[PDB]
Design an enzyme around this catalytic site. Sequence first.
Site, PDB file in Angstrom:
ATOM      1  N   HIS A 169       0.854  -1.185   0.000  1.00 39.00           N
ATOM      2  CA  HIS A 169       0.000   0.000   0.000  1.00 39.00           C
ATOM      3  C   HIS A 169       0.890   1.235   0.000  1.00 39.00           C
ATOM      4  CE1 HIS A 169      -2.597  -3.131   1.730  1.00 39.00           C
ATOM      5  NE2 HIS A 169      -3.602  -2.456   1.198  1.00 39.00           N
ATOM      6  N   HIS A 170       0.408   2.304  -0.630  1.00 31.94           N
ATOM      7  CA  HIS A 170       1.137   3.567  -0.732  1.00 31.94           C
ATOM      8  C   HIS A 170       1.345   4.284   0.609  1.00 31.94           C
ATOM      9  CE1 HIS A 170       2.231   7.569  -2.117  1.00 31.94           C
ATOM     10  NE2 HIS A 170       1.066   8.075  -1.753  1.00 31.94           N
ATOM     11  N   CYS A 171       2.556   4.790   0.829  1.00 35.72           N
ATOM     12  CA  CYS A 171       2.893   5.540   2.042  1.00 35.72           C
ATOM     13  C   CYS A 171       2.379   6.975   1.873  1.00 35.72           C
ATOM     14  CB  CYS A 171       4.420   5.555   2.247  1.00 35.72           C
ATOM     15  SG  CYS A 171       5.387   5.938   0.754  1.00 35.72           S
TER      16      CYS A 171
END
Length: 372
Positions: A169-171
């Site tokens: 998942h994107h930070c």
Amino acid sequence: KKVKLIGTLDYGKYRYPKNHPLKIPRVSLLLRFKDAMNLIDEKELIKSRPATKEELLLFHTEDYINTLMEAERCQCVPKGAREKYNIGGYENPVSYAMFTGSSLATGSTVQAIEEFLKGNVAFNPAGGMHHAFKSRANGFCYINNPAVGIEYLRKKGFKRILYIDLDAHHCDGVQEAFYDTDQVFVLSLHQSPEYAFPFEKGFLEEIGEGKGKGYNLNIPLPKGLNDNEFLFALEKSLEIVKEVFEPEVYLLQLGTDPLLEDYLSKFNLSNVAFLKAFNIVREVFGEGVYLGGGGYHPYALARAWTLIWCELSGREVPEKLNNKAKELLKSIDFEEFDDEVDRSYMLETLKDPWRGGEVRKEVKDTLEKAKA
């Protein structure tokens, strides 16, 4: 150069509630697992300490931090905090993980950095809570230890810090935190927001703003991702970063959610490709600060981070789990999402077989656009 693991069994008492994906034991489970496998000695373990208020304020605002402390000890959602700080809902619920557990994971990231700066190699599996914003909870995260850690380094005088996020998942929290500066470069590979959280950020065209335009690189990837596609994307994106940024120091987050067994990602990777990804980063940038990340399947998490610990620690990876280890994993009331896929085979070996395939045109196109 000593190799250290930062942790404590205390994380086991600050679990998320009921239904929540973080209800399961994680760093405490890793510790018990490596002990059961006889893959760790006392002198390699550093007991986690809480982040101090000062360390927390390197990134988060006082009103937000004070709200987390008040909400937790009084066990309530203060008036106006659900709306303002995103606290209280199913996602970022009131619990003792919200401040005590979060502070412990964050202090552990500062400890990991302290160890690295002494010239040693450290791994903080509790770290990598990459979704929290300066003044708001998000994606199960209340405190952004990667941002606290990076600001800790900036205060020490580092002017070129690279953060690499391999979690599925994107930070988004880390992206926002350094979107405006050219002193920090953030690279994230993750499931595309077109189909996965955070949905609102994580797209390839988000490359920064102002002085930082060109210092943020998102590599959104498709459903059903295989090992070859993940590593292809990793190698190509690292080359893009290397040609534009020469880090003085870098941090790497290693969530285990990209694995096939973790239902929170549509990625179907093997633990062995996860391990190779880690080593590919080290071959490109040398040694850095290592953090944990999202990972929601107990078996997947335990075996994968064990591979990471074995690599860092310099010990051979046993091909099988011993009895103490299998019984430990079997004792975790986890319940598989899919009524019956049968993941018991994971108990029969530490390393899973490769899970490769062809690299789809989509993936090649994303990396070509990313380069230009």
